Design a protein around this ligand. Sequence first.
Ligand SMILES: Nc1nc2c(ncn2[C@@H]2O[C@H](COP(=O)(O)OP(=O)(O)OP(=O)(O)O)[C@@H](O)[C@H]2O)c(=O)[nH]1
Ligand SMILES: Nc1nc2c(ncn2[C@@H]2O[C@H](COP(=O)(O)OP(=O)(O)O)[C@@H](O)[C@H]2O)c(=O)[nH]1
Ligand SMILES: Nc1nc2c(ncn2[C@@H]2O[C@H](COP(=O)(O)OP(=O)(O)O)[C@@H](O)[C@H]2O)c(=O)[nH]1
Ligand SMILES: Nc1nc2c(ncn2[C@@H]2O[C@H](COP(=O)(O)OP(=O)(O)O)[C@@H](O)[C@H]2O)c(=O)[nH]1
Ligand SMILES: [Mg+2]
Lengths: 430, 430, 430, 108, 439, 49
Amino acid sequence: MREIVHIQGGQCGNQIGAKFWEVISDEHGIDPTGTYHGDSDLQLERINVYYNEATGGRYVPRAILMDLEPGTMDSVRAGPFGQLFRPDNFVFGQTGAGNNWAKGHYTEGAELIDSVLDVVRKEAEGCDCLQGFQITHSLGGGTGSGMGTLLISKVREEYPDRIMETFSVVPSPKVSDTVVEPYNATLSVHQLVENADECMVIDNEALYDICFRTLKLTTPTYGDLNHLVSAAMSGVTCCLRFPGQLNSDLRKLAVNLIPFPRLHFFMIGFAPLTSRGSQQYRALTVPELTQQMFDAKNMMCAADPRHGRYLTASALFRGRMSTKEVDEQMLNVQNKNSSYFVEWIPNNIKSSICDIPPKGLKMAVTFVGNSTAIQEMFKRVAEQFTAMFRRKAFLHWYTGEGMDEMEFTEAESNMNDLVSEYQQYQDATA
Amino acid sequence: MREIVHIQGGQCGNQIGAKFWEVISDEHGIDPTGTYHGDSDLQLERINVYYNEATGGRYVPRAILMDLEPGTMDSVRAGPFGQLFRPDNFVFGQTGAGNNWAKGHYTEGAELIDSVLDVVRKEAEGCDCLQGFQITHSLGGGTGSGMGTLLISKVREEYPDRIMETFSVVPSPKVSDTVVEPYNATLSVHQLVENADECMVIDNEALYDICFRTLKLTTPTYGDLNHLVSAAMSGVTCCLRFPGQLNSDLRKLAVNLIPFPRLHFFMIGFAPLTSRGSQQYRALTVPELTQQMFDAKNMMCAADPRHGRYLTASALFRGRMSTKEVDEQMLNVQNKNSSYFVEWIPNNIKSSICDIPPKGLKMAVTFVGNSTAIQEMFKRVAEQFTAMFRRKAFLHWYTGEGMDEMEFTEAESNMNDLVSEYQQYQDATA
Amino acid sequence: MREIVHIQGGQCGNQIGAKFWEVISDEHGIDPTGTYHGDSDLQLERINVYYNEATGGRYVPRAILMDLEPGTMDSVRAGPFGQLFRPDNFVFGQTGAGNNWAKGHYTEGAELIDSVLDVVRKEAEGCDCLQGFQITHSLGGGTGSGMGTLLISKVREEYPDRIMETFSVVPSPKVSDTVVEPYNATLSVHQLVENADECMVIDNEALYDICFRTLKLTTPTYGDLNHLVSAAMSGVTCCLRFPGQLNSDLRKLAVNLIPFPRLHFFMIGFAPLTSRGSQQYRALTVPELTQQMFDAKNMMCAADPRHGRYLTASALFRGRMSTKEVDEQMLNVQNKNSSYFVEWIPNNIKSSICDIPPKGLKMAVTFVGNSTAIQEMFKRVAEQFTAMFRRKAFLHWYTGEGMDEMEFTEAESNMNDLVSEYQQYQDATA
Amino acid sequence: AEKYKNEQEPKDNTSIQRSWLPYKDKALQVAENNLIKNQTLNQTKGFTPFNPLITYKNNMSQVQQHDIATSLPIGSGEHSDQKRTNQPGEFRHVRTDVTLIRNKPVTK
Amino acid sequence: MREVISIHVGQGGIQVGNACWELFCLEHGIQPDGQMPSDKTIGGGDDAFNTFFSETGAGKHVPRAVFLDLEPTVIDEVRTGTYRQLFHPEQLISGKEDAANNFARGHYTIGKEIVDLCLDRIRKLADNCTGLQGFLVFNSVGGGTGSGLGSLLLERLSVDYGKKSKLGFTIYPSPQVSTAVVEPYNSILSTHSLLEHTDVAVMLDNEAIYDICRRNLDIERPTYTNLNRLIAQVISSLTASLRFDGALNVDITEFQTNLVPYPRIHFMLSSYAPIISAEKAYHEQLSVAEITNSAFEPANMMAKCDPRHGKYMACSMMYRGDVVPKDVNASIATIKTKRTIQFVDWCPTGFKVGINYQPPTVVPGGDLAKVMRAVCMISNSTAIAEVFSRLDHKFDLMYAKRAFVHWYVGEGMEEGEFSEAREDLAALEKDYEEVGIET
Amino acid sequence: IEQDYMYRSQQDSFKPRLLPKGNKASDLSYTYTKQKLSQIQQNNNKELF
Ligand SMILES: Nc1nc2c(ncn2[C@@H]2O[C@H](COP(=O)(O)OP(=O)(O)OP(=O)(O)O)[C@@H](O)[C@H]2O)c(=O)[nH]1
Ligand SMILES: Nc1nc2c(ncn2[C@@H]2O[C@H](COP(=O)(O)OP(=O)(O)O)[C@@H](O)[C@H]2O)c(=O)[nH]1
Ligand SMILES: Nc1nc2c(ncn2[C@@H]2O[C@H](COP(=O)(O)OP(=O)(O)O)[C@@H](O)[C@H]2O)c(=O)[nH]1
Ligand SMILES: Nc1nc2c(ncn2[C@@H]2O[C@H](COP(=O)(O)OP(=O)(O)O)[C@@H](O)[C@H]2O)c(=O)[nH]1
Ligand SMILES: [Mg+2]
């Protein structure tokens, strides 16, 4: 029943998924061996959306694991909840991309993607009624940013009417660990805007800021960051899996969040977040949830939303509450900050309610916002890209695989056009 | 309902606030763990005035703690009842004020005030209906006298209609604890006179006199002074929290006590204060209470009320008595002390009654007075200021932080003008 | 219609004009070639005030460049916007003045001034209806300080009715580039006091303080200071060139700003001045604009305006707004700073408004205030002059070109008379 | 803001010197309870830290070990649950079955 | 299943190889004889040592490296030392006459009869491995046989294998501290050969390490053993990512793709931190901030060059231990704020950071202490042209009078080689000059 | 001057055309949907062999 399959590649994508399905299995009460041990029947009624059926009553992922080197899968296999994954779904190369977009999208990708395409086609035809695809990857790496986007293009050509989600984590200029990231980042975003239906941008610097400021815990790791991202992911698809007052699917989100087909980049946030030394001192109420919703620092993106104007915003509430307080809070926040909302789209806020809170919580909030403040991140990335490109630095690697500067120029031109079209729709009045 | 928030900065303000919060938690029946262990239902009817409610039913005060060195607040969390305060309500610097008004009011004070302004705005908007603000601090110190008054200016800029109580522990020359006291004291009283709706002055020497004379205890210490100040400050707002016959709020006190906008400096007194020897040997009657209340030596100010004429007075009786005897005692004290009351206004003393006495006592009286005897503190502070400033001693520390001596000139002129316009009513006749 | 002709001399005036014409051409949409490229029709109806028509449609400034060193001329011609000037307007000597006021006012200035007189009469006859003359110069130089003042004297002789204004960059002692500054400054101010209808003084010390404090830019330059002065000097003639609620030309300002004929020296300021890294937030509403106006440390002069009492003030607002907030705020400033305003001239503020804001601003203002504060600068200049003159140091060159101590003694006597008569109005009471 | 000094002589026992109030000051006996409870709690673990004052700093915190359902159960930190030995060869790869292939199939 | 091949040519090359293989033998717990001593070792997927060793079908393990030298003394010393049972007997190729510090001897006359056997050994060892990552070569430039055999083998491999990655940890002569008197000549010749045949070249000057050892370890008389041990530590820190799991791992192909902007420029210099004695290890803090600040100090350069005279273009830093990415990022931000170190305009980001969990191991009887946090740094900077300029000065001063050139013309190579190599070096200095210019 | 002004004026007289039809997946899916909806009937018309 309108199920969705999972695709992921690259080291970052694999790390994200390894904990994201841990979160999902915890929510649905599935043990690491794949046997149901839940408490309520609702945790089992809609199990088919994520988990298939196997002999003995156990459940197996409809997830696909891809990469050019075996280290990441070797690591993910031995981790907790690693026994769920079917060994067939693993597809791995013996060479590695080496942080090279050209290698990951032209040379090794062309012959390796056939097997993963066959696997995903079989998985898609297996389900009775496919709903859409979700991709989770990083655009600073080589293997992800190349083969994942080539697969996105192929799947777009094969399945036109379906919806695609892209949890894109993009390197930021502050916490930078690779030198050739601007090139493959620009190439990936140019190829990605052409096919992706929805994009959610995630910044590691923003996540570090969240952990340092809100959680106030001294020494987090990549695990905690992956946990935050996984909670954000599980939030958006909750209403599809559990009953609620107002039903909402990803197609409804796209319709209410896409004013124009070229404007499909969002910034996401989660509430509530609080340190362990301050948990006893906070009362969970709709006012607190909605004020932490719209706080600028809480966002998972480097873009400051108060530098621009929101085009659309969406909210998914989890838990039991009445519609009145949610509606009046939305009205209140739209009234008090009219300057931060565009004027020719009245009532630019969408709400949904699901009555099943996350395990160990009573109320929760997921926010997805489409605003014009995202353009600054693209502006900085393009600045770095052109600064490196005027001197033709590190270009011989990319030219060594049939690539030339034609696609460089057209990609940067398309990206500048995208920035200009965000600026235009922000600076326009009736 | 019609609740008030609390703010304290500086070491003295922090200690006074801590003791006041212990006293209020005692009166309303809250344990150090924040869980209600009260007896009568009256302790919960108006609990929301001073406390918010959180998960688990625990109540937290709506207080803000501010300072420039974490030592005092690190001690206050360690002390008893230090767990009540929410950790987010603590804001601290890292350098300290160094008894320098310039540091605390211009460079680093303005650098740090943004976060505390954010927190106080959040808390003020969270509650249903504000009734006013109450500040407790010192003028002889650096961080209090600077950053507190800067915050006063900022918050008055944003909430013009709300009432503002200030509990200022002004300096006295007999009990000297710093050499640069007159400078920052004059600056802060300058910046405070135009913004504070009511100032109430408290003298450490006066409290020492109270303890040595009336209480007759051998070795008193700042805990006792803090606790007396807390008792008076709690008695100020008894009627707003408990039922009575004639309820009187802060605005009622202001209207009854303020004939002119610039005449808002008050002196306070608390009764009954009994020594260790006669707690069982003195009757509790309205005549005895009023006789101890009107005693000049019982005041919390070094100034002698016997050297001036009261403009207005107000008393807040607690417990059960007869309004007619309250009125008769007031009328007798007015007739037999007619020389001490300004003639051109009739019946310049107000009485209010609340039905709940302080915990562990039968009847109590809180007295607030606006008289002309307050001029002595300003006179002595000003003469010290001029005698120290004509030589420009200790001036370079101030002037080396973007600060100029001309504002000192204006402060001295304004204090002379305030003294003159406050004393001309002493001799003014109808 | 009612145009004003620009005449600049000396290096200071040349650099001032180099940026004035830049700012004016930018405001009116004129390229370096005198080619119009504006968008609105409102940029051209009053373009004849500063420009003359040439064949082919080009607009050229009515500016006269005069100097003694050709170096300034061929430096300013080679720069941008230098082709606007007609070469026939360039007049320069070949021997220089050597910062010798006597040599520039008696020996070479009289010999050379004939040609510039011819050209200025040609321009004055060419203009349809002359409104006045405006001059820019400095008293810290020799050639300017002499030939300017002589030119003002003579042109006032020929045109005793037409108004005229001059801007003077007066020398400061803390940062002083000449030991001859007292001598030529005193001589030139003596010449100017009886001739200039309006004089407006500028202090490079105050400019440095402003660019260090409110701009927070680490490295200022003479170009930056010239830009600031050009912005202020463009603001004054706003409503003369553009419509508004209350147009107020130079004659209106002269009528409303000078109480007595000998008191025509002005200190000015501009607002708002935001930092270079200004975050995008809010807007410059009337309250903060008028507060930044009357910040005495915003003034472009080293004189402390609170040292004395304002004789009168004037405000030119630029942008679209109502006059209710205007006049209520001006009265609020009056009432709050009644000590700084002399009582026998109540309601002593000019309010004027123009509808077209400066480029890149929504709201702006220029302030021009006549206050009793300038007497200190005259006092210190006179003290330095008499200290240097008592032993007749550097006097022998000034005596070697035709004049003697009589001119110096009469100049200093006139200066002392000016200061004294300027001060009696300070302590005069109603 | 004080010494809590309790001793038989009254001039320096505080609780004897704070008794002039109309009521019992909840503070003195609260500290008594904190001291006696801290002693018992230290008895459970075993610290004997040369004086009771050392562990009283952190025997009073009410922070629970786990979250109380007002924040994500991210725990106290993955790094907190880490233990480190430093023998050579402890962090070598394992090559699980999914990546454990031999035969390299000949045809497609 | 990933392996690298080690080449040790020259007397200094063999001495470096001895120490690095001692370290490798220790860190996997291999006994000097060659067999696993624990007896608790398991099979399955514990073959981490495959990157360096190979299972021998019966018991022991043989290293994947070859030793080449024309002078038999050092090879005989290895064959009679404590590691007799470790190496394959026909894996340490020995010549019969030394080159006697002449490049022509090892490049035109004698090396031709040894290069064939060396290539046969390389091929027969290579078909054994299946996941060849690349080749590491060690050679002292200022030696005849070293330079000649290195050049000849590099040319042969460049056409026999093609695109396989090559990293050369070369020992150039010091600007003032030197043993021979004719090393500028064969250094010129070796540089000419090496410029267009190696993918990465790493400076390993001697007096820099001498000064570092004197300053830090408080040793007044270090010998070549300390040098070789530090080199082994550097190599192990470089390679540990291929055989130890970590948060952010890197590969051999991950360095040239992020360190050389242009094919012509591939020379760079290294640093290692911290260098601390046992007694010193106590009274210090050893945090990531101070170790990463020490790594960029000019005195900590592995080569005698001052980066303050030039610009930076790329640098790769590998941390090993219990470091955290947030702390290394904060240190990077502090470095970027620091003004003494400046980067070229067209490289806004120039940091490639890797993190590994395995702390460094300590060799018993060594000098250096051990701490659980170490950093190894490989930077390419414009300032490296200083050493080439100095060596050019040395070459000119003696080529003006045609000294010693008869013992270069008498072995068949024409005198015209010197002019060609000089022109190539001049062009290289030119390129290193214009690469640093602002646009 | 005259010719430059002519060129500038004739170029400035041209600008107001936006007509937003960014079309990659929107138009690809539009073509797919219209093809399906149209060719279903043309499939249910064929004369059998
Ligand atoms: N850093 C370092 N350098 C060494 C070592 N051994 C030799 N060298 C260098 O090698 C140079 C001389 O060449 P050698 O290595 O001794 O001999 P070769 O390179 O094989 O050439 P031949 O002399 O013909 O045998 C000396 O100048 C040293 O700088 C060593 O153990 N460590
Ligand atoms: N938030 C987050 N970021 C990660 C994680 N793993 C890797 N990254 C980021 O991904 C970047 C490296 O990407 P890379 O592994 O080369 O991508 P790949 O080549 O496609 O595998 C680093 O800058 C990390 O910041 C993770 O688990 N969580
Ligand atoms: N009554 C009373 N006065 C206090 C207390 N603590 C400090 N003071 C007074 O405050 C003065 C010092 O002020 P200070 O703490 O330096 O001000 P700050 O620097 O702004 O915090 C001293 O003269 C004391 O008399 C207290 O607990 N009770
Ligand atoms: N604000 C400003 N001041 C200037 C400029 N040029 C010169 N000055 C000031 O003028 C003084 C010297 O004047 P001077 O050049 O001798 O005048 P001249 O003899 O008429 O050329 C110096 O103290 C400078 O501060 C300028 O472009 N802007
Ligand atoms: Mg040798």
